[PDB]
Each structure stands twice: as C-alpha cells, then as structure tokens.
C-alpha cells in the first residue's frame, strides 16, 4: 500500500487530494493532517508514509525533513529555490489540473522531482 | 480495510500491537497516536478508523466517545472501580496489559463485531 500524507488546513483540499489520488492509483491511501505539528505527531507515533504533500513555511519543510529525511516531501521563484535547497522533492501549483497532480505524484514517488515550467 | 488506532505513548507497545494485530487479521491496518489529544486532532481532520485502543484517563475515554460515538473504544490497562467507571463512560472493552497476546486478538475480534471484552477479574 502506498501512503501519502497531505498536510493542509482545509478539509476541501485534503479530501479533494484523497479522492483524486485514491481513484487514480490502485494501492493508494491518503491520510490528512491540518498542521505541521500534527503531521510530526502523526509521524512519531510510527505511522509510515511514502510522500508528504505540504501546504504553503520553508520552516515546515525543514522540520519534516529534520524528523526523517528519508520521506519525500513536496510542496503544494525564490520560494521554489529556497524549497529545493532544503531538500524539497517537488513543487506543485494548487492551480494545476488533476492530471498534473497525479503525474507529479507518480514521478515523485519514483524518485524524480516535479517543478512548474515557470521556474524552468 | 479495517483501521485500528492505538493511542499509546510507547513506541514498543505500539509496534508490538501493530505486528500482532496485522499478523492475525488480513484486512487490518494499525495506526498510532501518541496521546488522546493527537488522536482527537487526527480524527477531527476527517481520518477514519474502526477501533481505538486507548492506553491507561477516563476523561480521555469520555472525550473520544463524545467526539465520535460511532467509534469503538477499548482501554488497554496496566491495572473494579476503574473498569466500572470505564463502562459507564461507554468503553467497549478493557484489556489487561498483562494479557496473553492471543486474548488481545480475540478481544479485538469481539469488539469489532459489536461485543464487549472484560477480564475475568471483573
């Protein structure tokens, strides 16, 4: 089972991501947290994940990597640049269509990085 | 997929329950929470579970049941008044910490089927 933790303070966002990703991927489970601090407590209690999608600040990213750099963390120019330096595995616009999110997640789960073309 | 949340501040106690339960039941995923507070945040976020195993205290049981009565909640306790208080607050079970692993499996089966486990002591 693939496990993605979405860390965002709007239920609509976390549920949209869950419905999308669980529908597109066969062995996929999406769990939610509302804050960085809630995500870190989830992670201490031994709950393992393949990827964290983290809402946007860089300090959240730093905290989550500090806990366990073996977890991919992707965010959802300066920001992008800063994120990458802290070890972000991706940056997905919230404006991006379903298909982009699905394929960016695939790539990131395979060890690749997704960035928006604006940056590139 | 059956989801059991273990609310216990002790890594080995969590991992012990996860290995045992996932080992015994084919459709089961065991998740952890450090404290009742963290368990209530996880649940408010709209993460769903089938059964909550709470380490022991009664207020925590009370909080969890007022929050989502549709969740079964059983106490796992290192420790008659206590059990009695628990049941009145609606606990679905009380499993001694010193219980044989196989008793935990069978208590979990019963609790999921809508029954109550209580130790013989009581």
Residues composing chain B: 122
Q: Measured between alpha carbons, how far is A74 from A61 in angstroms, rounded to an integer?
A: 9
Q: Which of A32, A38, A47 sits opposite B46 (nearest CB)?
A: A32
Q: Measured between alpha carbons, how far is A5 from A53 in angstroms, rounded to an integer?
A: 6
Q: Which of B34, B44, B45 sits opposite A44 (nearest CB)?
A: B34
CB-CB contact of A29 with A3 (8 Å): yes
Interchain pair B47, A34: CB under 8 A: no
DSSP string, A62-79: HHHHHH-TTSEEEE--HH
Q: At what angle do helices B36-44 and A36-44 cross, to 10 degrees?
A: 120
Q: For B15, which residue in chain A has the nearest alpha carbon?
A: A46
Residue B65 φ then ψ, to 5° = -80, -45
Experimental structure resolution, Å? 2.1
State which approach was used to obtain the coordinates.
Answer: X-ray
CB-CB contact of B109 with B21 (8 Å): no
CB-CB contact of A95 with A14 (8 Å): no
Question: What are the tokens at A58?
Answer: 């860089």
* Domains (range + CATH), chain B: 1-122 (3.40.50.2300)
In sequence order, what are the beta bridge partners of A30? A4
The DSSP element (H or E) to which A50 belongs, if any, is: none
Token look-up 């015994």 returns B24
């Amino acid at each position: 089972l693939t496990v993605v933790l979405i860390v965002d303070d709007h239920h609509l966002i976390r549920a949209g991501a869950k419905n999308l990703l669980e529908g597109a991927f066969s062995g996929m489970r999406v769990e939610g947290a509302e804050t960085v601090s809630d995500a870190l407590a989830f992670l201490e209690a031994d709950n393992t994940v393949d990827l964290i999608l983290l809402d946007v600040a860089i300090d959240g990213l730093v905290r989550l990597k500090r806990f366990d750099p073996s977890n991919a963390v992707a965010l959802i120019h300066e920001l992008i640049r800063a994120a990458l330096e802290a070890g972000a595995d991706g940056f997905i616009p919230k404006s991006a269509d379903p298909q982009v999110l699905i394929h960016a997640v695939s790539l990131i789960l395979e060890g690749e990085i997704f960035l928006p073309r604006s940056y590139l």
